[PDB]
Amino acid sequence: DLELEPTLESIVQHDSLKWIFVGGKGGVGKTTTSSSVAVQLALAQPNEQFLLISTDPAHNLSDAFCQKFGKDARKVEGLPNLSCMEIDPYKTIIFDTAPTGHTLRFLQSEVNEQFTNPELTTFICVCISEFLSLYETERMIQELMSYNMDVNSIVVNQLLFAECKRCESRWKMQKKYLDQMGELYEDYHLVKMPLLGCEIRGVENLKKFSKFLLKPYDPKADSDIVFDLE
Ligand SMILES: Nc1ncnc2c1ncn2[C@@H]1O[C@H](COP(=O)(O)OP(=O)(O)O)[C@@H](O)[C@H]1O
Ligand SMILES: [Mg+2]
Ligand code: NA
Ligand SMILES: [Zn+2]
């Protein structure tokens, strides 16, 4: 079977991973995706300890989790096996690389043997379906491949789906690039994630978002999620 599952299932069930990097253009949903992945990992294996670290020069994790984080790791309230860390420079470390274009200088020696080992390290690209993000995602992947960092999954986030005149017009754009991505990323897990009815904040909402990272979102059947955030 040549059609890869459009999910992060292969990554979250990849028991040997030590590093899960998350990268992409500013605003595409790296805080959201990296936090949701970390929440899923923590929930699935409650006896193992997970760290979510962000290099974003922002209180991104703090605002997403509604809890104060910093340079020292601190456990997430309600998920005692997940810690978060915000540092402007564990079974698995999930690593939001914001700003990705700069952090890709930092990821540059026994750590390197870890990074270039596909059994220990993967890099999830996040993008939105518009020209700049797509083309910068292509560029980022080419660069990661040249440094032998594994990439097998790409999240396309903030999608509107079939069917509001503005939304119809915007979906016309989105699907044009989505169709292009389908072809570009045939050898990849290409996860289609919908735009929700509000920002994604708090552990409960992050958990809900993470559901469709692991099971393919069907806009005809699953659209309650858009309005299901509290
Ligand atoms: N699928 C989505 N639906 C609704 N809001 C989203 C979605 N993805 C991200 N967001 C929101 O969009 C904003 C940017 O997302 P964020 O994950 O912080 O991007 P990044 O970390 O890539 O800069 C945040 O305020 C976040 O709550
Ligand atoms: Mg930024
Ligand atoms: Na390669
Ligand atoms: Zn609309």
Author numbering: 2 to 90, 156 to 174, 220 to 274, 280 to 346
What does the paper say about this structure?
To obtain the nucleotide-bound Get3 crystal structure, we have expressed and purified Get3 from another yeast species, D. hansenii. The finger domain in the D. hansenii Get3 structure, however, is missing in the electron density map. In the D. hansenii Get3 structure, the bound ADP plays an important role in associating the two Get3 monomers in the closed conformation. However, in this paper the structure of D. hansenii Get3 complexed with ADP was found in closed conformation.
Recently yeast genetics and biochemical studies indicated that the post-translational insertion of the TA proteins into ER membrane requires the co-operation of the Golgi ER trafficking (GET) complex which contains Get1, Get2 and Get3. Get3 can recognize and bind the TMD of the TA proteins. In this study, the crystal structures of Get3 from two yeast species, S. cerevisiae and D. hansenii suggest that Get3 may adopt two distinct conformations: an open conformation in nucleotide-free state and a closed conformation in ADP-bound state.
